[PDB]
C-alpha cells in the first residue's frame, strides 16, 4: 500500500497546484505500467492550462528500437522525450533544457515557471533533476 | 518476464525446470546455505527480485505493434 498515503497525495496535489509544467516520468521497460492515467485525467479535466509532457527515462536499459517505438506510440498522445539520467554520462539533457526554455519563453508574462516531476517511485525523477543541474 | 538466455548469462547457471529448481541451483552455486545445509530460498528470491527491479537483469515489455 506504499505510495497511496494521504500525506504523499497531499504533496502531489501541492506540487501540481504550484507547477506550470508537469513532467510525467515513465520507465522505458514498462511505460504503460508506470503511467498515472487518473492523474492525467484530473489534469486534463481540472487544470487544462498546465502543460503535461512525458519523459521516458532509463532508455539505456532497452534496445534502441524499443525506445524509438515507445516514443513514437506515446507521441500520438503527449510530447514524449527519451532520456537517460546521469550526472556524468547522460542522454537527452540538452533536449529537455531547450524544451524548458521554449516553455519559459511562451510564459514570458510570468516572471518564472515551475516544472514539477511526477510519476511512479524509482522512475528517476531526482536523477533527472540532478542530471539537469549537473550536481 | 525474463529470457532464459539472459537469466543464465546473468547467474552463470542452467539446467532448471521450475522456479524452485532455479532458486536451489543459484543458492548452491552462491553458497547461500542455511545452518544445516538447507538453501536460503527467501534470501535468494529477495536478491533476485532486487536485481530485477534495479536493472541487473535485462528485460522489457514489448511495444505495441506497428501499423
Amino acid at each position: 500500500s506504499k505510495g497511496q498515503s494521504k500525506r504523499i497525495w497531499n504533496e502531489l496535489y501541492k506540487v501540481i497546484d504550484s507547477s506550470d509544467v508537469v513532467i510525467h516520468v515513465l520507465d522505458a521497460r514498462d511505460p504503460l505500467g508506470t503511467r498515472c492515467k487518473s492523474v492525467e485525467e484530473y489534469m486534463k479535466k481540472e487544470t487544462p492550462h498546465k502543460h503535461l509532457i512525458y519523459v521516458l527515462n532509463k532508455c539505456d536499459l532497452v534496445p534502441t528500437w524499443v525506445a524509438a517505438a515507445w516514443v513514437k506510440h506515446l507521441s500520438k498522445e503527449r510530447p514524449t522525450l527519451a532520456f537517460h539520467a546521469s550526472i556524468t554520462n547522460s542522454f537527452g539533457k540538452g533536449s529537455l533544457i531547450q524544451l524548458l526554455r521554449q516553455f519559459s519563453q511562451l510564459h514570458t508574462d510570468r516572471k518564472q515557471i515551475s516544472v514539477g516531476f511526477i510519476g511512479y517511485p524509482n522512475t528517476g525523477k531526482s536523477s533527472i533533476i540532478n542530471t539537469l543541474r549537473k550536481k | 518476464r525474463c529470457q532464459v538466455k539472459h537469466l543464465e548469462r546473468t547467474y552463470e547457471i542452467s539446467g532448471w525446470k521450475d522456479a524452485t529448481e532455479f532458486i536451489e541451483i543459484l543458492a548452491r552455486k552462491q553458497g547461500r546455505l542455511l545452518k544445516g545445509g538447507e538453501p536460503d530460498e527467501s534470501g535468494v528470491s529477495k536478491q533476485i527480485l532486487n536485481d530485477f527491479n534495479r536493472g541487473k537483469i535485462p528485460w522489457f515489455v514489448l511495444p505495441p505493434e506497428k501499423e
Binding site: 539505456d60 534496445p63 527519451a82 | 543464465e8 535485462p58
Partner: peptide, 25 residues
Amino acid sequence: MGKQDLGKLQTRKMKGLKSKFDQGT
C-alpha cells in the same frame, strides 16, 4: 521537440547481454 537521435545513445552493457557467459555450450 527537435530531433531525438537515439543512435547516439549507448545502452548499458549488462552481464546478460554478453555471449562470453554462455551456458551449455
